[PDB]
Design an enzyme around this catalytic site. Structure first.
Site, short mmCIF file in Angstrom:
data_model
loop_
_atom_site.label_atom_id
_atom_site.label_comp_id
_atom_site.label_asym_id
_atom_site.label_seq_id
_atom_site.Cartn_x
_atom_site.Cartn_y
_atom_site.Cartn_z
N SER A 1 14.91 -6.05 3.91
CA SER A 1 15.54 -4.89 4.50
C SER A 1 15.31 -4.77 6.00
CB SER A 1 15.35 -3.59 3.72
OG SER A 1 13.97 -3.29 3.66
N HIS B 1 13.48 -7.37 -4.15
CA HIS B 1 13.05 -6.49 -3.05
C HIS B 1 12.81 -5.07 -3.59
CE1 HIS B 1 12.08 -5.28 0.92
NE2 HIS B 1 13.30 -5.15 1.47
N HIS C 1 3.98 -11.27 -4.07
CA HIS C 1 4.42 -10.92 -2.74
C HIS C 1 4.62 -12.17 -1.89
CE1 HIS C 1 4.64 -8.65 1.10
NE2 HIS C 1 5.08 -7.69 0.30
N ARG D 1 -0.85 -0.25 -0.77
CA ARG D 1 0.08 0.78 -1.13
C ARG D 1 -0.03 1.10 -2.61
NH1 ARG D 1 5.53 -1.55 1.06
NH2 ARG D 1 4.49 -3.44 0.18
N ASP E 1 5.64 -1.64 -5.80
CA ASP E 1 6.60 -1.24 -6.82
C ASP E 1 6.08 -1.08 -8.22
OD1 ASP E 1 8.98 -0.90 -4.98
OD2 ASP E 1 8.62 -3.07 -4.70
N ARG F 1 12.30 3.85 4.25
CA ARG F 1 12.42 2.67 5.10
C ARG F 1 13.16 2.91 6.42
NH1 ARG F 1 10.38 -2.50 3.97
NH2 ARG F 1 8.70 -1.07 3.30
N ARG G 1 19.88 -15.90 16.20
CA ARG G 1 20.78 -16.97 15.81
C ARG G 1 20.04 -18.29 15.79
NH1 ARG G 1 23.79 -21.19 13.99
NH2 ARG G 1 26.05 -20.88 14.21
C1 LIG Z 1 7.96 -10.78 -4.25
C2 LIG Z 1 8.32 -12.23 -4.62
C3 LIG Z 1 9.85 -12.45 -4.59
C4 LIG Z 1 7.74 -13.20 -3.61
O1 LIG Z 1 8.32 -14.53 -3.78
P1 LIG Z 1 7.64 -15.88 -3.27
O2 LIG Z 1 6.88 -15.62 -2.01
O3 LIG Z 1 8.74 -16.87 -3.35
O4 LIG Z 1 6.65 -16.02 -4.55
P2 LIG Z 1 5.76 -17.32 -4.81
O5 LIG Z 1 5.60 -18.21 -3.61
O6 LIG Z 1 4.52 -16.84 -5.48
O7 LIG Z 1 6.57 -18.06 -5.98
C5 LIG Z 1 5.91 -19.12 -6.69
C6 LIG Z 1 6.50 -19.19 -8.06
O8 LIG Z 1 5.92 -18.08 -8.81
C7 LIG Z 1 6.96 -17.32 -9.36
N1 LIG Z 1 6.63 -15.90 -9.48
C8 LIG Z 1 6.25 -15.19 -8.38
N2 LIG Z 1 6.11 -13.90 -8.64
C9 LIG Z 1 6.44 -13.76 -9.99
C10 LIG Z 1 6.48 -12.66 -10.88
N3 LIG Z 1 6.21 -11.41 -10.54
N4 LIG Z 1 6.87 -12.89 -12.17
C11 LIG Z 1 7.20 -14.13 -12.52
N5 LIG Z 1 7.20 -15.23 -11.78
C12 LIG Z 1 6.80 -14.99 -10.51
C13 LIG Z 1 8.09 -17.44 -8.33
O9 LIG Z 1 9.34 -16.96 -8.81
C14 LIG Z 1 8.03 -18.93 -8.06
O10 LIG Z 1 8.72 -19.71 -9.05
P3 LIG Z 1 9.73 -20.91 -8.68
O11 LIG Z 1 8.83 -22.04 -8.28
O12 LIG Z 1 10.40 -21.34 -9.93
O13 LIG Z 1 10.53 -20.50 -7.48
C15 LIG Z 1 7.74 -12.58 -6.01
O14 LIG Z 1 6.34 -12.64 -6.20
C16 LIG Z 1 8.51 -11.95 -7.19
O15 LIG Z 1 9.46 -12.55 -7.72
N6 LIG Z 1 8.11 -10.74 -7.60
C17 LIG Z 1 8.78 -10.02 -8.69
C18 LIG Z 1 9.76 -9.01 -8.08
C19 LIG Z 1 9.14 -7.85 -7.27
O16 LIG Z 1 8.11 -7.32 -7.66
N7 LIG Z 1 9.79 -7.42 -6.16
C20 LIG Z 1 9.32 -6.31 -5.32
C21 LIG Z 1 8.49 -6.80 -4.10
C22 LIG Z 1 8.08 -5.64 -3.13
F1 LIG Z 1 7.14 -6.07 -2.24
C23 LIG Z 1 9.23 -5.15 -2.32
N8 LIG Z 1 9.55 -3.87 -2.50
O17 LIG Z 1 9.81 -5.92 -1.57
O1 LIG Z 2 7.00 -7.15 2.79
C1 LIG Z 2 7.92 -7.59 2.05
O2 LIG Z 2 8.33 -8.78 2.00
C2 LIG Z 2 8.37 -6.72 0.92
C3 LIG Z 2 7.68 -5.36 0.85
O3 LIG Z 2 6.65 -5.18 0.23
C4 LIG Z 2 8.41 -4.28 1.63
O4 LIG Z 2 9.43 -4.54 2.28
O5 LIG Z 2 7.88 -3.15 1.58
O1 LIG Z 3 28.29 -19.54 15.15
C1 LIG Z 3 27.98 -18.38 15.55
O2 LIG Z 3 26.86 -18.02 16.00
C2 LIG Z 3 29.10 -17.43 15.80
C3 LIG Z 3 30.49 -17.98 15.49
O3 LIG Z 3 31.17 -18.58 16.30
C4 LIG Z 3 30.93 -17.71 14.06
O4 LIG Z 3 30.17 -17.13 13.25
O5 LIG Z 3 32.07 -18.13 13.77
#
Ligand SMILES: CC(C)(COP(=O)(O)OP(=O)(O)OC[C@H]1O[C@@H](n2cnc3c(N)ncnc32)[C@H](O)[C@@H]1OP(=O)(O)O)[C@@H](O)C(=O)NCCC(=O)NCC[C@@H](F)C(N)=O
Ligand SMILES: O=C([O-])CC(=O)C(=O)O
Ligand SMILES: O=C([O-])CC(=O)C(=O)O
Ligand SMILES: CC(C)(COP(=O)(O)OP(=O)(O)OC[C@H]1O[C@@H](n2cnc3c(N)ncnc32)[C@H](O)[C@@H]1OP(=O)(O)O)[C@@H](O)C(=O)NCCC(=O)NCC[C@@H](F)C(N)=O
Lengths: 435, 435
Positions: free
Chosen positions: A242, A272, A318, A327, A373, A399, A419
């Protein structure tokens, strides 16, 4: 006597000069390296943006202008008789980097009450939306629809010199923050209290309070929950979806309304902000499957089923955090003090002891700890706000504070178009040799 | 017999495996370094994303799956009796990386005609919008409002295993591409041909053609202009605002509708897609100030005034391109063949000889050459589409093609959440020592 605009006017030039010289001395200094894996991995681990308002520590959690959550709880002005920090003061701190006075804080409050007003076209739009249209979607659409009022869009179109952009961003930021609650509340009422009105803004109350009144909630502890909610969800550095979305879109000169609405589209993603809602839906199925008081072995079972089904456990993990989110803790603390015996709370509590272990066992998640969350909806449910599909809207409202705070700064400092260069798998294989 | 879905089903696994092994061998290989200045500078020069559909060369311009514009003009199927490449075939090429047959192309055409249909809530919404609400805003709002129909949103909510995401993204991508023209055209008619209808889709025509009929244009050369327009504006690698925005938002699992609408908010920025409209408004003032046939010295004067006033010269410069945009050239070529004597065209032509020089003289722009936006509205104006505030919508319609093409791929390949690390000026000064 209090005027944030005048404060910023003094602050801006000093910061300009400071970055100027810094860049003069270190602009060519390398802060990192890019590897194949980071590119493939959604820039994980890449230092890529300058974001002034808050900085997240993987171990310690978020710091707002240098202050951790406990520090804010302790330094920020509170409501009369209150215990929770007013979001108004958090805004002031983000924007100026200084802790505000209560007098300053009350000025923000009046400003936000003075500026709250919706144009008929937006009202009409909300009232015509279908009930099956998701709350976040109705929110985003409405914010986009408000851009006809953009002060920034209008000055740009008039040919304003680029050095004055911030001034117009500031105005729109304040107007938008002021309107958010009315928009958000109109959706709540149209969807869930059909036939009733949000009423009027009381220039005498704080922002959170006018919000809860428009939402139709009387409990004073609820008002307190809101102040906290809205403060803690405010900002989370710049790389989160976001925030990054608002940054990138605002970088092209799109007005704050458009940048904010795009960010909301980002927040609405399951990975997210939508997790808040997803956590609750997950719990509901849980309790439905297993029924209210489960055994640890059955909780494990249920967790494994989700994981085995190619799904995520909502509210856990995360991208940057490596330990339990402050939080989350901060919310736990509130629950313990106010609704310690709630069964749902208790369930959430029990999951804290189980989930991370299963995750660790599974071996995929980098961070097995809970994030914000995992704990929010449970608090809301308790006070009577059981509409889980609406939860993300609250996150959205909060936010705005952080993203709009930075937005003014980005334009004040003259940050350019975001960019980066993209690459194809083939182009990259060539760049190296290929594998 | 033709089914892109079946083709992709075979393609996906091969690519997965190929990236797998590559990463196995080179994931830790460094492709670049990050400096202070890149962070401060909207990631300029940073290799940060993997985007398969197109790659931009700073000297040569865009390549779509390896083919330059002239190559496409030459290889892509054209309409019966036509000269311009059908956008349908461009889509096929982006998606599969292979040049399609005319038979394949006609299948896309039928598919897109079959899937075009708007839900009443969206129609109602458009019809209720005020005339002072900008076209891009009405567009974005409407796309967001369509998410109630998302197939992806629905399957996610049903717990679909993550390996099947692409399948649902694909469906929504095709449905959305199909609906775009009806949405876009309804806005055009409500705003500019009030009281008239867009009519119906002819399952027998190509996409561009049904579009121009709904827009109410009869000239066959116009139809040809459209096919070209829509093909050339389709994609521009992944780091551009709109594309990056869709990428980042889709990365959180937001559906294609939401990701697309956020991208549109990005496109609506003056430094991005809105330049097309801005170019025309700039020309109008020009011709108004100076009057139809200006002298070079007066053109210079007028350019300098803009620059001295803290404004940009629209349609000139680029974040990555270092030479004249092939999209510009390609448009010039069309003008020369079809409306060589248009005064506006002539004006645009004259600016080509002046602008870059002034810019060079000024010493700020990295690229003094024109970009695609410098030449598009002039062509549109010629055929009777004089509503300059609507121009960006056309760009929007086109861009869906590239962004949605990649979107399917991102989910097929399992790209994760885009989440880079941010830094504050203070945190960064510390990281180094400070300046
Ligand atoms: C937040 C999150 C997307 C971060 O992703 P990322 O940094 O890619 O996580 P990571 O490096 O640990 O991922 C390693 C593996 O563990 C998996 N994994 C991570 N968190 C997991 C969870 N809660 N449940 C199941 N699998 C999970 C992840 O999907 C990945 O699998 P792949 O190799 O197949 O891609 C992730 O931990 C997730 O999927 N959480 C569940 C959704 C969630 O709670 N979202 C809200 C987050 C909050 F902070 C916000 N409001 O933004
Ligand atoms: O920090 C992030 O990637 C997600 C998060 O917890 C938020 O946007 O509050
Ligand atoms: O490439 C860029 O940064 C901008 C541009 O010309 C497009 O999105 O078509
Ligand atoms: C496209 C553009 C934003 C790229 O930005 P960026 O890579 O930061 O440009 P750059 O590195 O050359 O900037 C160097 C300096 O020259 C300035 N400059 C660049 N292009 C300029 C132009 N057309 N007119 C005036 N000044 C310009 C630029 O603003 C910058 O000044 P500051 O130091 O004060 O920031 C830029 O050249 C511009 O402002 N163009 C005018 C708007 C436009 O035509 N947009 C449509 C672009 C099109 F490709 C699209 N549809 O996306």
């Amino acid at each position: 006597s209090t005027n944030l605009k005048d404060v910023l006017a003094s602050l801006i030039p000093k910061e300009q000069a400071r970055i100027k010289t810094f860049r003069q001395q270190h602009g060519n200094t390398a802060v990192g390296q890019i590897t194949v894996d980071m590119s493939y991995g959604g820039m994980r681990g890449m230092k890529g943006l300058i974001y002034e308002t808050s900085v997240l520590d993987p171990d310690e959690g978020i710091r707002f202008r240098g202050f951790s959550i406990p520090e804010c709880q302790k330094l920020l002005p509170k409501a009369g008789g209150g215990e929770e920090p007013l979001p108004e003061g958090l805004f002031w701190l983000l924007v100026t980097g200084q802790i505000p006075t209560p007098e300053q804080v009350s000025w923000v409050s009046k400003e936000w009450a003075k500026r709250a007003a919706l144009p008929s076209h937006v009202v009409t739009m909300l009232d015509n939306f279908p009930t099956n249209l998701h709350p976040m979607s109705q929110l985003s659409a409405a914010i986009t629809a408000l851009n006809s009022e953009s002060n920034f869009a209008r000055a740009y179109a008039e040919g304003i010199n680029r050095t004055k952009y911030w001034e117009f961003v500031y105005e729109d930021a304040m107007d938008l923050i002021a309107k958010l609650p009315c928009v958000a509340a109109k959706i709540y009422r149209n969807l869930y209290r059909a036939g009733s009105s949000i009423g009027a803004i009381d220039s005498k109350l704080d922002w959170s309070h006018n919000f809860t009144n428009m939402l139709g909630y009387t409990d004073p502890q609820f008002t307190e929950l809101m102040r906290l909610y809205l403060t803690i969800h405010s900002d989370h550095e710049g790389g989160n979806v976001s925030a990054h979305t608002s940054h990138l879109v605002g970088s092209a000169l799109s007005d704050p309304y458009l940048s904010f609405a795009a960010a909301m589209n980002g927040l609405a993603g399951p990975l997210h902000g939508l997790a808040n809602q997803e956590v609750l839906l997950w719990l509901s199925q849980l309790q439905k499957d297993l029924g209210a008081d489960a055994s640890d072995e059955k909780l494990r079972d249920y967790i494994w089923n989700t994981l085995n089904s190619g799904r995520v456990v909502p509210g856990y993990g995360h991208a940057v955090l490596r330990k339990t989110d402050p939080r989350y803790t901060c919310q736990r603390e509130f629950a313990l003090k106010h609704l310690p015996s709630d069964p749902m709370f208790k369930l959430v509590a029990q999951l804290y002891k189980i989930v991370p272990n299963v995750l660790l066992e599974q071996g995929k998640a980098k961070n097995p700890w809970p994030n914000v969350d995992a704990h929010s909806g449970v608090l809301l449910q308790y006070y009577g706000m059981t509409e889980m599909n609406y939860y993300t809207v609250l996150f959205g409202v909060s936010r705005a504070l952080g993203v709009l705070a930075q937005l003014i700064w980005s334009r004040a400092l003259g940050f350019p178009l975001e960019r980066p260069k993209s690459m194809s798998t083939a182009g990259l294989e060539k760049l190296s040799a290929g594998g």
